[PDB]
Design a binder for these strands. Structure first.
Ligand SMILES: [Mn+2]
Length: 745
DNA sequence: TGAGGTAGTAGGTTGTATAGT
DNA sequence: CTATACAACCTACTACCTCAT
């Protein structure tokens, strides 16, 4: 076996309790309260005084050296009060920002290649390094020929306990930048339209996109009311337009939309948001090159953070505070407790299966009773490829033969499909306007000889005449007909290939068409613990003020999806009511009653995005029905990463291993080998319950292995994962009542 | 949209650790 | 009993990669 760790660095030495300088902030201008301007006063007195450390405790303010207080600042004025040695046992945050400050000050003087500053530092948690690492440990810049800049984005967040020892938690993630602007991209005549841009000067938040580019110069007064150079002289920003030459005044104005107004900002300020769309459409060699550097296995992340901490060195302002360069050998020393979860034994038609691929020889666990008649849309210039495709997937579904040749890997009749090729419904459709796609799906649902659509769509790329996917899924969800839709590229894989590169695709096709007609391929053989049903819940929030109400999902102790339940009344705000929880848990009790002739006695409630609020309702509802129950909060995206160790060597962790402290657990559920990155684990915390977190996490991981619409396991559990996929597809579900056919899959 | 994973970019909210009072 | 900030959380979108029983 092996051991697990978190990306953490011990501190050699200890912070001895330093002498600070208390300060005070009075709301001289309009901001009467001290809370709304304590951050801005912190940065202002940090900036006016040679970037010396300035700290904040809840209403007060601090420094670390005696700094002359000032009164000229218009929003607030600062006055010295006193100077004390702050006790380390009662101050964790402020010695945290001490150690964070001295990491920033020790790194600001580190230069690479002689002249070039290796790090960009604004005295915070975020430390951008201009220099990446490579796999061969070369501190090398990474630039394009065009002017794109990959960079690291290190993140210190040290904590220091009551005694004095400090633990430096790190996480390297990379960063995309470019030196060029909208200015330079106009000067080399690139069509800058439709780009996502970032205002480098004004720090407004909002997805700024380019509408047009006005032919008027940026030195001429506009509809804003003045010249734009006057606009930046009047924002205390005129040192940016002071550098402007004649040709900089020969730039022309680029208007921009922020979904609330249009601005008029000069192209020298703006800069395109380098997404992978932009790297792909503008220099694909750079994008394919840096994909090895973006995705980082834990060994290369440890090498990157080793370079970072060796560039900390030793801080002589904090009693020679050094940080170690290796991780902890065990997170027992940090607080966590590690282990690996044994994988669940899964079963289909005939018992235990060795892999999830073997089910096509074995056979599916449940099939919905009846025959399921196909029906196919396909593009009008893509006819023979589509007929070969549906021939392939229908031979794999019905006949058990893969491009004609029957094999031992696939058993026959695994879906009870009914597709007579000379008799059943095909419709062709020309790739055109949206109402053609709507009437095309309507035309396939006129002829009522279809029980499962298998449409063919153009590819997600090739942004000429658009994807037929979304209008088809909207229509086939409104009209209650499940539809597994295929790309033309996958159809051409089915037509053209003489290899298994259509077989793996075809496995996932048939698992999709099984789950969408209401059959479930695999279940667990035995779910550990004493449990009778699982109830996933989740909610959503699209943007500001938009909220998705809570759609549930109901399993059994095998993990087969009994039901999923949209509730009736929409919520108010983020917090769903008590009536929603009332009808959801009434209907899980009804549904488990209907499936099994009895009530659940143990209901494990996985959930995401719920607070510890409204636990009192859960106590109420399952005391009054005396059903003991658990609530396990499964957090989808945690920033913690987990490494592994075989005698000091860092690798990715295998799937199933966890780290656990009390009732918060992190667990890697997905197996990601090197050259594809590090696994991004699951944060799992028990809100209320009485089961140990070993069986709680075992139910979690066993529900990750039962993704019923692919062959490789979903990272999330199928409770929280399928609950969230129902919450995203909030329209495709009918309002308020149950279904079993996994449309989202 | 074969499928799932990583990762970027961007933008919101807010539960819980944490100071006084 | 109450007022924070802020590391975590969530959301949306792509691109890249590999699927071996
Ligand atoms: Mn699908």
């Amino acid at each position: 076996v092996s051991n697990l760790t978190v990306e953490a660095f011990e501190g050699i030495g200890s912070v001895n309790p330093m002498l600070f300088y208390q300060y005070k902030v009075t709301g001289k201008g309009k901001y009467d309260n001290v809370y709304k301007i304590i951050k801005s006063a912190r940065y202002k007195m940090h900036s006016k005084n040679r970037f010396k450390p300035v700290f904040i405790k809840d209403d007060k303010l601090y420094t670390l050296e005696k700094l002359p207080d000032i009164e000229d600042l218009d929003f607030a004025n600062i006055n010295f009060v006193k100077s004390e040695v702050l006790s380390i046992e009662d101050n964790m945050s402020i010695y945290g920002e001490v150690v964070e400050y001295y990491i920033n000050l020790k790194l600001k003087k580190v230069k690479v290649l002689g002249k070039y500053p290796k790090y960009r530092i604004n005295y915070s948690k975020e430390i951008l390094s201009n220099t990446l690492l490579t796999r061969e440990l070369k501190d090398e810049f990474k630039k394009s020929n065009k002017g794109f800049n990959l960079k690291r984005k290190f993140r210190i967040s040290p904590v220091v306990n009551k005694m004095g020892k400090v633990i430096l938690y790190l996480s390297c993630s990379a960063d995309f930048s470019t030196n060029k602007n909208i200015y330079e991209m106009l000067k080399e005549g690139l069509e800058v339209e439709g780009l996502a841009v970032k205002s480098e000067w004004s720090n407004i938040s909002g997805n700024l996109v380019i509408e047009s580019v006005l032919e008027t110069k940026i030195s001429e007064p506009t509809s804003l009311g003045q010249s734009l150079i006057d606009y930046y002289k009047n924002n205390n920003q005129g040192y940016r337009v002071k550098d402007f030459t004649d040709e900089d005044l020969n730039a022309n104005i680029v208007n921009v939309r922020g979904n609330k107004k249009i601005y008029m900002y000069i192209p020298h300020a703006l800069k395109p948001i380098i997404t992978r769309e932009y790297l792909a459409k503008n220099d694909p060699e750079f994008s394919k090159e840096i994909e090895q550097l973006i995705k980082m296995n834990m060994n290369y992340r440890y090498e990157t953070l080793k370079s970072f901490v060796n560039d900390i060195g030793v801080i002589e302002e904090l009693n020679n505070l050094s940080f170690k360069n290796k991780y902890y050998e065990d997170v027992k020393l940090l607080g966590y407790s590690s282990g690996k979860i044994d994988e669940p034994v899964l079963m289909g038609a005939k018992g235990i299966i060795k892999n999830k691929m073997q089910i096509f020889s074995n056979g599916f666990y449940k099939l919905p009773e009846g025959k399921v008649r196909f029906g196919v849309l396909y593009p009008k210039e893509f006819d023979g490829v589509s007929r070969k495709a549906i021939r392939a997937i229908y031979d794999f579904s019905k006949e058990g033969k893969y491009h004609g040749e029957s094999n031992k890997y696939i058993a026959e009749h695994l879906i009870n499909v009914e597709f007579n090729p000379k008799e059943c419904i095909f419709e062709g459709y020309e790739l055109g306007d949206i109402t053609e796609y709507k009437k095309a799906a309507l035309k396939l649902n006129n002829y009522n000889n279809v029980d499962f659509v298998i449409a063919i769509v153009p590819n997600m790329s090739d942004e000429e005449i658009e994807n037929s996917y979304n209008p088809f899924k909207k229509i086939w969800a409104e009209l209650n007909l499940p539809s597994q839709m295929i790309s033309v590229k996958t159809a051409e894989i089915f037509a053209n290939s003489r290899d298994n590169t259509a077989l793996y695709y075809l496995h996932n096709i048939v698992l999709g068409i099984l789950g969408k007609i209401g059959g479930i391929p695999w279940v667990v053989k035995d779910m550990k613990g004493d449990v009778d049903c699982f109830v996933g819940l989740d909610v959503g929030t699209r943007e500001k003020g938009i909220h998705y109400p809570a759609c549930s999902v109901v399993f059994d102790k095998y993990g087969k999806l009994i039901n999923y339940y949209k509730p009736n009344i929409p919520q108010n705000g983020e917090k769903i009511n008590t009536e929603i929880l009332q009808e959801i848990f009434d209907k899980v009790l009804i549904s488990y009653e209907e499936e099994n002739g009895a009530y659940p006695k143990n209901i494990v409630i996985h959930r995401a995005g719920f607070s510890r609020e409204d636990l009192d309702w859960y106590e109420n509802y399952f005391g009054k029905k005396n059903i003991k129950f658990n609530i396990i909060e499964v957090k989808k995206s945690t920033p913690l990463k987990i490494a592994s160790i075989n005698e000091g060597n860092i690798t990715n962790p295998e799937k199933g291993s966890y780290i656990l402290r009390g009732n918060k657990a992190y667990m890697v559920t997905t197996d990601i080998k090197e050259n594809l990155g590090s696994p991004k684990p699951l944060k799992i915390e028990k809100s209320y319950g009485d089961i140990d977190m070993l069986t709680a996490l075992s139910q979690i991981y066993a529900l990750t292995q039962i993704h019923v619409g692919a062959t490789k396991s979903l990272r999330l559990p199928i409770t929280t994962g399928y609950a969230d996929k129902i919450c995203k597809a909030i329209e495709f579900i009918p309002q308020g009542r149950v279904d079993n056919r996994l449309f989202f899959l």
